[PDB]
Structure formats: structure tokens, C-alpha cells
Design a protein around this ligand. Structure first.
Ligand SMILES: CCCCCCCCCCCCCCCCCC(=O)OC[C@H](COP(=O)([O-])OCC[N+](C)(C)C)OC(=O)CCCCCCCCCCCCCCCCC
Ligand SMILES: CCCCCCCCCCCCCCCCCC(=O)OC[C@H](COP(=O)([O-])OCC[N+](C)(C)C)OC(=O)CCCCCCCCCCCCCCCCC
Ligand SMILES: CCCCCCCCCCCCCCCCCC(=O)OC[C@H](COP(=O)([O-])OCC[N+](C)(C)C)OC(=O)CCCCCCCCCCCCCCCCC
Ligand SMILES: CCCCCCCCCCCCCCCCCC(=O)OC[C@H](COP(=O)([O-])OCC[N+](C)(C)C)OC(=O)CCCCCCCCCCCCCCCCC
Ligand SMILES: CCCCCCCCCCCCCCCCCC(=O)OC[C@H](COP(=O)(O)OCCN)OC(=O)CCCCCCCCCCCCCCCCC
Ligand code: SF4
Ligand code: SF4
Ligand code: SF4
Lengths: 155, 49, 318, 115, 176, 45
């Protein structure tokens, strides 16, 4: 029926959206350097279509790479709000995941998921560039299985 | 004649994957058409080169 | 049939822009010991399609403080100018055959500065306006050297007709006669398309993306298409101006192959500059233009007016 | 007129690309999403930031240079006169005056991006 | 001893001044930069084809945690709580009691993997090689809750990865 | 059994270069200006 056309269109749009995952460089702490190591030639995140992007207006995924402090959280939420949709958040490292080494500190928010919704939690302190790349491909596979147009067709 | 050998190595990559269908299978799955030595296969079907 | 000519000019140019994005990414990657797009399709050949599809399905955030009339007029003007710059180009025979083709290009490219003056003003934000003003000043300052270099080179052509460039360069390239003007012209073209160490309006590490911060998805995509069309067009103009290809009236495909190859080589050089140098400061490029390029350009215009007269080598005007 | 058709086609297709680009995506907008971008905070409007006499001076000097360039453009046809010595004298005269304007701006501060 | 990095004065003769003028006007060092990038374009890239190819690691690599057993299948952990005491992030939570057979065994063994700093101090402190950091590094999750590990989760990790965990330990225990 | 830890080879390692090595390459300025002038001359002719 007409649900086959909607499924094909959803597949096309979700292939185009995961083949051009343009992330935003939110490098807060030590996790930032492993992410530019996943950028480096050995892993070459650009070969997956994952470019080095710029201002959140052209970014599709936020990578929270490092400790989020209380002083810094409003800016992170501001730039998250400024991202056009669809947008995704990857929490990279223990600090961004649940506070990490600084979980019991007066100045550290315990996990960026208190500030933004998080799609992928990449564990490690820091996660290796390969671990972050695995998280990115896992996010890609999350996008592949979205059914936005099939949800709309049954509304 | 060295570029001739480069072209021969590419053509043998085509032949080394069991034809054009097998060559395209590994081109579109693994994004790579190198022919290695099979060291073993696990019980889940993965082949190691 | 002429409408089909217009279409078969425009559409392949946009496709060439789309795959120029991929080619630039791959050249940058291989100069940086990486690969670049090689997963989305064979050798990243479907990547431009993925980018175009993702962009047109992404939410185009328009600013709350934006004069939407000019906010949408600026991309229309930019893309219309970028496309119409190809209509006089003599791939062997032009779509539009004018007496003043290069004058027409100069005028049309000087109208393209409005797309930044209108985008920066429309976006408000009170800061992208400053970047827009810097871009406009850079553009108008390098227009001077473009115009004077074109004037000096065309004194061997005898007219502003671009088809006459093929005849002028029948036996020898114009590079062998005006190479200093060729270097200055090439760097001026680099600076006009906001490329290379001259990409101050969109400094990735200076002002994030400058005048294009507020634009997103679709209008950003069209601005990008306009810039890359201008890049390829300027390299085509450079190839026709300085590296004139031999023309066979009974086999124009040979000229087309020659011209396309040389245009691609110059475009690959444009991408080659991007991967090799640091970025000029704004005052530093303004100093370059005003105190280095302009005096030599004036002197060489003098020289190229004197030269045909004192050697009895003045070209025909027909 | 062929050129008019070409301009119409270029403008029409650019505007059509706008229409698809600016109406096809699915939207969901709130106040903090479309807030002006300032690297994670709010921008200050202040009061007429785009100032400094140097930005205006480069525009004016470009204008005057562009006027002299307008005077130089007829040169390819000017070399086709029998009275070539007068034409050469006048073209070189115009170029010396261009060089003199550049030199006078140069020596009297002019082209400088001062403190 | 020291050395000067920028204490050379340029020569001021005809040939040197002309060399510098040619370098200024003909852009020769810019051409050297173009040559370096062109030479890099014709070098084989260092990129590996992930995930079909993997980055090289060592037996000492500290990844996902696991609880180990003796060959008899009996747990190694005797709930001394040394790992919990030494844990820099206080990521380890332990409760214990006498087992029905009288053994000294844990009833709670949690690792907050989002508190963990993956320092490996727990496997150093452990006197019986019960808690280890395994080789796994691809265990990203879609929710925060799947990273708060249980005793059952850690024991299943041990049963899952013991074959290569034991080989790594045999490779490196003589350094420990 | 004797001790066995990570050690240098019995003869030590070979020398490693550390000093700057930017080779001298190209022609003199006189040659470049002569070539540039002759190119323009032949173009003019
Ligand atoms: C260069 C590019 C040239 C043009 C390329 C055109 C490509 C056209 C192929 C399809 C493009 C994407 C269509 C779907 C839009 C994105 C999406 O997933 O929307 C989900 C949405 C989901 O709607 P919903 O109502 O379920 O959810 C919206 C409300 N919230 C978010 C609160 C839950 O779909 C729609 O809004 C309706 C889509 C109708 C069908 C459109 C078919 C394609 C039309 C153009 C051809
Ligand atoms: C979107 C914004 C686009 C801006 C630029 C629009 C195009 C301007 C250039 C038009 C062509 C041109 O000048 O060709 C010169 C060239 C100059 O060379 P030529 O005139 O020697 O060409 C050969 C002519 N014979 C054979 C006589 C020698 O002329 C032509 O291409 C054709 C000349 C006749 C043109 C008749 C129609 C003119 C329409 C002009 C535009 C009017 C609207 C302008 C925009 C208004 C907006 C509200
Ligand atoms: C008989 C013959 C009579 C006529 C003789 C004609 C003159 C012959 C001798 C002149 C040679 C120099 C010509 C002009 C060169 C530029 C002038 C200038 O200011 O240079 C120094 C200027 C300024 O250099 P600077 O900053 O060192 O010096 C500034 C002034 N001082 C010394 C006081 C500090 O540098 C540049 O312009 C740099 C450009 C940056 C971009 C580099 C791009 C590299 C890649 C280029 C590839 C090739 C381009 C062409 C491709 C093909 C196109 C078709
Ligand atoms: C665009 C196409 C041209 C691109 C640039 C040239 C090719 C670059 C890659 C190959 C060269 C690698 C570098 C090299 O060999 O440098 C040798 C040398 C390196 O010189 P150097 O920087 O060691 O200085 C030694 C020479 N003195 C002291 C006199 C300055 O450079 C050259 O030989 C440059 C010669 C050409 C200069 C540029 C000409 C531009 C105009 C052409 C027409 C327009
Ligand atoms: C033998 C054949 C002749 C050999 C050449 C002889 C003359 C050499 C050139 C003149 C050198 C004058 C001295 C000098 O170096 O002046 C530099 C000075 C300031 O330069 P600036 O870069 O601003 O540095 C500021 C301080 N850091 O400069 C200034 O303050 C002002 C410089 C003004 C230059 C104007 C140039 C106009 C265009 C000239 C070329 C076109 C032809 C004009 C007619 C020429 C007729 C000969
Ligand atoms: S998780 Fe570890 S490596 Fe990453 S920012 Fe926090 S302390 Fe640094
Ligand atoms: S690796 Fe370190 S932080 Fe993690 S549980 Fe063990 S001792 Fe605690
Ligand atoms: S895992 Fe090891 S160190 Fe931790 S309580 Fe058990 S026996 Fe003690």
C-alpha cells in the first residue's frame, strides 16, 4: 500500500542524515584530544562523511567531550537549543556521563544528561578514539532505525 | 611496465574476490577490495584476514 | 532549443559544484595523510547527494531579527549571478556572444558583493555586520586589480570579446606574455572568491563562519553553491585568459576537453592553496593589495599600453 | 532576446531553489532556539557598532580608483587611432595620475590601519 | 649549554639581496609549501578501515570491568573490599555476608562506570585477581542506566570475556 | 635462569637524527630573473 512509499522515503532521509552527521566541537577537557585523535589520519572521521563543522546552525550532533561545570552548563544548554533539528547529543567520557572523577564536587554537574537529552553514552576516561568512533557509528545505526514518516502515516 | 603491474594487481583483486559480484560485495560492505590470506573463520561466520 | 542550451549549461554546472565539494574534501584529505569521503558510495561518489539531501531536510533556522525579504533575496542574487557568469564563456562557442563579455563578467561579479552586504545586514546580530563590511571592503579592493589586470591583458586581444581570446592565443599561451599579471590575477581571483588565506569572511578559526552564521540548511546550501560555482567559473576564466586552448572548428570537442582539463587543474590548485598556507590577517591582505599588487599592476598596465605601440604589435579590433 | 531568457531562467531557478530550501524541511521552533548566536550566550546590541573612519576611507578611495578605472576601460579601442603618440601620452598621463593618487594616500598615512 | 634560535643576520651583498628579491617576487617558499603538500598527496594514508580493521592494543589495556572465577567455577572475589577502599572515584559499592555454604562472598558488587576513571587501581589492589579491567572498549550505551553495572552484569562480563582476559593476564602477570 | 627485562641491544642503538634538515634547492635569483625576462621576451616576439 502507501506505507511502502513512506517507508522508502524514511529510509532515504535517514540514510542522508546519517551519511552527513556533522558534529559540533564541544571540547571541554581531556576527552577533547581523543576526539581530535578520532579526527586524526588513523581514524579519519571525515571518511564517514562526519565533517569538521562550525557554528551550531550547521551541526547535527553535539559531542560533550569533557567535564561540564556549573559555570559552563548554561552555555552548553544555549548552544544545544540553537542547534537546528534533528539534533543528537553524544556524552563522551565519565565526566560528561555521570560526573566521573569529579562527581562529588561542588562545581561539577553530575552528567550532561541533567542539562540536555543524550542519545549515546560513550564510557571511558577518556574513551579511546576508537571507542568514540564506535559510539558515532552506533549513533548512525540509531538514525537508520528511525521511523518518522511511518509514525506520521499511522497518525 | 610498473603501471601495467598496478593494473594487473587491481584486476587480480577483482579475480581474487571470486568474480565481479564478490568484488562488489566486499567493495560495498567493507569499502575495501584488498585480498589477504584467510587465517580463520569463527563459528559466527566472521572471516579473518 | 536555446532553452535546452540554457538548461544543459546550468544543470551540469550545479552537478560539477556538488562533486567539487567531494573532490575538495578528498584532495584535502590526501594532502593530510587521511582519505576523506570513501564510505558513502564508491569512493564517496554519493556523498554530495547525501549532503544535498540532508541539508534540504534540515530545519532552516531563520533569525528573529532578520529582514526576511533581503534574507531570501541575497541567496537568489548570489546564485543567479553565479549561474549567469557562465553564459558568455567561450567553451568553444558561447551561449551568449557579446562584444563586451569580460566587461559583462566584471560587472556581474561586482554585483555579487551585494549578497554579503545584504546577508550581513539582514542577519543583524550586530557582529556579522562587521564581518560583512570586512568582506565587502576586501572584495571591492581586489576588484581594482581584477579590472586593471584584465585591461592590461586585453590590450593584446584588441577587444572585450572572449571568443577573440582563442584567436589571440592560437600560437602561444598568454601566460608566456603576461606571467606577472597572471600571478597577480590568480591571487586576486583567490581573494575575490573568499578562498585560501583570503577566507576572512568565513574564518573557521577567526569568526566561526562570519556572515553565514545565521544561514542554515537550504539558504546556506545555495550560498555554498554560489561560491563554488564562482570558484569554477573564475578558474575557467583564468584558463581561457592565460592558457588558451587550440581550437578546431570541425572538432570543438577537443577544445572542450582541453578547457575542462585546464579548468579542473586550476580548481585543484585552488584547493591546493587551501591545504598549504596560514591565513592572512585582514589588514595584511589589505596591505598586500594596496601597497604590493596595485603599484605593480599600474606599472604593468603602463607597460602593456606601451608595448604593442612600440613594437607595431597592436591587435585588430575586429 | 536570448540574454533576457537566460537571466529569467537563472533568477527563476535560484528562487525555486529558495522555495524548496526554505519550505520543505519539517520545523519545530521555540524562543531559545532562534536566539542570536553568540558562542553560548546572548549578544549585546550596544549602539551602532560598525564604525571607524578607516572602513569608510577604503570605500571612498576604492570609489575614486574605480572612477579612474572607468576612464581607463576605453583603452583597447584607443590604440586603434592613427594619432598614437597623443593617445599614448594621455593614457600614460592617466596612469601617472593614478600612481600619484596612490602615492599621496600612501605617504600621508592614508592606506594605514592605525591604532 | 644553550643555543640561539633566531640570531642569524642576513647577508647584504648583490647575490643574497637578489636571492631574497626573487624569493619575494616569485613566491619560492610558497612553492616549497605547495611541493610539501603535493608530496603528501602521493603518500599512502595512515587511515585504517574501521571497524574491519582495529587500532593496536596491548595486554595491559584497561577497558570494561569483569569479575573472574577459579577453574572450578567458584568466584574469586572474597569481598575483602580492597578495590572499594582504593577506588579513586568511589565507583565500587560492595555488600557482603556469609554464603549459605559459609563462604565469604559479595551480595552487592556495583561499579558506576560513569563514575569510573578506568585507572585500574581495583585490579592492582585485588589479592585474588577477581576484579579486572578487560580488553573490551566498545560498550557504548543509548541510556545512562545501562552503565551502572551490577554483580550479575560484571559476572556475565567475566564469563563473556574470560577466554581473552586470561590470555592477557598470562601475558602480563610476570610484570606484576 | 638469568633476569630478562627490556634492555638496549648489546651494541646500543643506532644514531638518531635530531638536527634541522631543510635542504637547499632551486636556482639563484639571477637565473630566475633571467628566465622570467627571456620568457616575456619570447612571448612578446
Ligand atoms: C537537492 C534537494 C532537492 C529536493 C529533494 C527532495 C527529496 C524528497 C524526499 C523526502 C524528503 C523528506 C520528507 C520528510 C520530511 C522529514 C521527515 O522525516 O518528516 C517527518 C514528519 C513527521 O510528522 P509528525 O506529524 O509525525 O511529527 C511532527 C510533530 N512532532 C515533531 C511534535 C512529533 O513528517 C511530516 O511532517 C509529514 C511528511 C509528509 C510526506 C512528505 C513526503 C516528501 C515530500 C517532498 C517530496
Ligand atoms: C537577479 C539580478 C541580476 C542582475 C543582472 C541582470 C542582467 C544584467 C545584464 C544584462 C545583459 C547585458 O548587459 O548584456 C551586455 C551585452 C554587451 O555586449 P553586446 O551588447 O555587444 O552583445 C552583442 C550585441 N551586438 C550583436 C549588437 C553587438 O549585451 C548583450 O548581451 C545583449 C544586448 C541587448 C540586451 C537587451 C536586454 C537587456 C536587459 C538588461 C537587464 C534589465 C534588467 C536588469 C535588472 C533589473 C532588476 C529589477
Ligand atoms: C622586458 C620585460 C619587461 C617587463 C618585466 C615585468 C616584471 C618582471 C619581474 C616581476 C616579477 C614579479 C611579478 C609580480 C609578483 C607578485 C608581486 C608581489 O607583490 O609579490 C610579493 C607579495 C608580497 O610579498 P611580501 O609580503 O614578502 O612583501 C611585501 C613588501 N615588503 C617586502 C616590504 C614586506 O606576495 C604575494 O603576493 C603573496 C601571494 C600569496 C598567495 C600565494 C599563492 C601561491 C601559489 C601561486 C601559484 C601560481 C599562481 C599563478 C597560477 C596560474 C595563473 C594563470
Ligand atoms: C599552480 C601551478 C604551480 C604551483 C607551484 C609550483 C609547483 C609546486 C610543487 C613542486 C615544487 C616544489 C618546491 C620546489 O621545487 O621549490 C624549488 C625552489 C625553492 O626555492 P627556495 O625557497 O629554496 O629558495 C632558493 C632560491 N632563492 C634563494 C633564489 C630564492 O623554488 C622554485 O624553484 C620556484 C620557481 C617558480 C616560482 C613561481 C613561479 C610562479 C609563476 C608561474 C607562472 C604563472
Ligand atoms: C634603476 C631603476 C629604478 C629603480 C627603482 C628606484 C626607486 C625605488 C622605489 C622607491 C623606493 C622609495 C623608498 C621606500 O622604500 O619607500 C617606502 C615607503 C613606505 O613603505 P611601507 O611599506 O608603507 O613601509 C612603512 C614603514 N614600515 O613608501 C612610501 O612612503 C610611499 C611609496 C609610494 C609609492 C607609489 C607607487 C605608485 C605606483 C608606481 C608604479 C607605477 C608607475 C608610475 C610611474 C613611474 C615612473 C618612473
Ligand atoms: S572523562 Fe576523564 S578524560 Fe574525559 S574529560 Fe573527564 S577526566 Fe578528562
Ligand atoms: S578502574 Fe579505578 S575508578 Fe574504575 S572502578 Fe577500578 S579503581 Fe575505581
Ligand atoms: S574484587 Fe578483589 S579487591 Fe574487590 S572485594 Fe573482591 S577480592 Fe577484594
Amino acid at each position: 500500500r502507501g506505507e511502502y512509499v513512506v517507508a522508502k522515503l524514511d529510509d532515504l532521509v535517514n540514510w542522508a542524515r546519517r551519511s552527513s552527521l556533522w558534529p559540533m566541537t564541544f571540547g571541554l577537557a581531556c576527552c577533547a584530544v581523543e576526539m581530535m585523535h578520532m579526527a586524526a589520519p588513523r581514524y579519519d572521521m571525515d571518511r564517514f562523511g562526519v565533517v569538521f563543522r562550525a557554528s551550531p546552525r550547521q551541526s547535527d550532533v553535539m559531542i560533550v567531550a569533557g567535564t561540564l561545570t556549573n559555570k559552563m552548563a548554561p552555555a552548553l544548554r544555549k548552544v544545544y537549543d540553537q542547534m537546528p533539528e534533528p539534533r543528537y547529543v553524544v556524552s563522551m567520557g565519565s565526566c560528561a556521563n555521570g560526573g566521573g572523577y569529579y562527581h562529588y564536587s561542588y562545581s561539577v554537574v553530575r552528567g550532561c544528561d541533567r542539562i540536555v537529552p543524550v542519545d549515546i553514552y560513550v564510557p571511558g576516561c577518556p574513551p579511546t578514539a576508537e571507542a568514540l568512533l564506535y559510539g558515532i557509528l552506533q549513533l548512525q545505526r540509531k538514525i537508520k532505525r528511525e521511523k518518522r514518516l511511518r509514525i506520521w502515516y499511522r497518525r | 611496465m610498473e603501471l601495467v603491474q598496478v593494473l594487473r594487481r587491481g584486476l587480480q583483486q577483482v579475480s581474487g574476490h571470486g568474480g565481479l559480484r564478490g568484488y562488489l560485495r566486499v567493495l560495498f560492505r567493507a569499502n575495501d577490495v584488498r585480498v589477504g590470506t584467510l587465517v580463520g573463520e569463527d563459528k559466527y561466520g566472521n572471516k579473518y584476514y | 532549443m536555446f532553452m535546452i542550451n540554457i538548461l544543459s549549461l546550468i544543470i551540469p554546472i550545479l552537478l560539477a559544484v556538488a562533486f567539487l565539494t567531494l573532490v575538495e574534501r578528498k584532495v584535502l584529505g590526501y594532502m593530510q595523510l587521511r582519505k576523506g569521503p570513501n564510505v558513502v558510495g564508491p569512493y564517496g561518489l554519493l556523498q554530495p547527494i547525501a549532503d544535498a539531501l540532508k541539508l534540504v531536510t534540515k530545519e532552516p533556522l531563520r533569525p528573529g531579527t532578520s529582514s526576511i525579504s533581503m534574507f531570501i533575496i541575497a541567496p537568489i542574487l548570489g546564485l543567479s549571478l553565479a549561474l549567469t557568469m557562465w553564459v558568455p564563456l567561450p567553451m568553444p562557442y558561447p551561449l551568449i556572444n557579446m562584444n563586451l563579455g569580460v566587461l559583462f563578467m566584471l560587472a556581474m561579479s561586482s554585483l555579487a558583493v551585494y549578497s554579503i552586504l545584504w546577508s550581513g545586514w539582514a542577519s543583524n546580530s550586530k557582529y556579522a555586520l562587521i564581518g560583512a563590511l570586512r568582506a565587502v571592503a576586501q572584495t571591492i579592493s581586489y576588484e581594482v586589480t581584477l579590472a586593471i589586470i584584465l585591461l592590461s591583458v586585453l590590450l593584446m586581444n584588441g577587444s572585450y570579446t572572449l571568443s577573440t581570446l582563442i584567436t589571440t592565443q592560437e600560437h602561444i599561451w598568454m601566460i608566456f606574455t603576461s606571467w606577472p599579471l597572471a600571478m597577480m590575477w590568480f591571487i586576486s581571483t583567490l581573494a575575490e572568491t573568499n578562498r585560501a588565506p583570503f577566507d576572512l569572511t568565513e574564518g573557521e578559526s577567526e569568526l566561526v563562519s562570519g556572515f553565514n552564521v545565521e544561514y542554515a540548511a537550504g539558504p546556506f546550501a545555495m550560498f555554498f553553491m554560489a561560491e563554488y560555482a564562482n570558484i569554477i567559473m573564475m578558474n575557467a576564466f583564468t584558463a581561457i585568459l592565460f592558457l588558451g586552448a587550440s581550437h578546431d572548428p570541425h572538432t570543438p570537442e577537443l577544445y572542450t576537453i582541453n578547457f575542462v582539463l585546464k579548468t579542473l587543474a586550476l580548481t585543484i590548485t585552488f584547493l591546493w592553496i587551501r591545504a598549504s598556507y596560514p591565513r592572512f590577517r585582514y589588514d595584511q591582505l589589505m596591505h598586500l593589495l594596496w601597497k604590493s599588487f596595485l603599484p605593480l599592476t599600474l606599472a604593468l598596465c603602463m607597460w602593456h599600453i606601451s608595448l604593442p605601440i612600440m613594437t607595431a604589435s597592436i591587435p585588430p579590433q575586429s | 532576446m536570448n540574454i533576457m531568457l537566460t537571466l529569467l531562467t537563472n533568477v527563476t531557478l535560484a528562487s525555486l531553489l529558495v522555495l524548496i530550501a526554505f519550505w520543505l524541511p519539517q520545523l519545530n521552533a521555540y524562543s531559545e532556539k532562534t536566539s542570536p548566536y553568540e558562542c553560548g550566550f546572548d549578544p549585546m546590541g550596544s549602539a551602532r557598532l560598525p564604525f571607524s573612519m578607516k572602513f569608510f576611507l577604503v570605500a571612498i578611495t576604492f570609489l575614486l580608483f574605480d572612477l579612474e578605472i572607468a576612464l581607463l576601460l576605453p583603452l583597447p579601442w584607443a590604440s586603434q587611432t592613427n594619432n598614437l603618440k597623443t593617445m599614448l601620452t594621455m593614457a600614460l598621463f592617466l596612469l601617472i595620475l593614478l600612481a600619484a593618487s596612490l602615492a599621496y594616500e600612501w605617504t600621508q598615512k592614508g592606506l594605514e590601519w592605525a591604532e | 649549554t644553550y643555543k640561539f634560535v633566531n640570531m642569524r643576520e642576513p647577508s647584504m651583498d648583490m647575490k643574497s639581496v637578489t636571492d631574497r628579491a626573487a624569493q619575494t617576487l616569485l613566491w619560492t617558499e610558497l612553492v616549497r609549501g605547495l611541493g610539501m603538500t603535493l608530496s603528501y598527496l602521493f603518500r599512502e594514508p595512515a587511515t585504517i578501515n574501521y571497524p574491519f580493521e582495529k587500532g593496536p592494543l596491548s595486554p595491559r589495556f584497561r577497558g570494561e570491568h569483569a569479575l573472574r572465577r577459579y577453574p572450578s567455577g567458584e568466584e574469586r572475589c572474597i569481598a575483602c573490599k580492597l578495590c572499594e577502599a582504593v577506588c579513586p572515584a568511589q565507583a565500587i559499592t560492595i555488600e557482603a555476608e556469609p554464603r549459605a555454604d559459609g563462604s565469604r562472598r559479595t551480595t552487592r558488587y556495583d561499579i558506576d562506570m560513569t563514575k569510573c576513571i578506568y585507572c585500574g587501581f581495583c585490579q592492582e589492589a585485588c589479592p585474588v585477581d577477581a576484579i579486572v579491567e578487560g580488553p573490551n572498549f566498545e560498550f557504548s550505551t543509548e541510556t545512562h542506566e545501562e552503565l551502572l553495572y551490577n554483580k550479575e552484569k560484571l559476572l556475565n562480563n567475566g564469563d563473556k570475556w574470560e577466554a581473552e582476559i586470561a590470555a592477557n593476564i598470562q601475558a602480563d602477570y610476570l610484570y606484576r | 635462569s638469568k633476569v630478562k627485562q627490556d634492555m638496549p641491544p648489546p651494541g646500543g642503538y643506532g644514531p638518531i637524527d635530531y638536527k634541522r634538515n631543510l635542504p637547499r634547492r632551486g636556482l639563484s635569483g639571477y637565473s630566475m630573473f633571467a628566465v622570467g625576462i627571456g620568457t616575456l621576451l619570447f612571448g612578446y616576439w
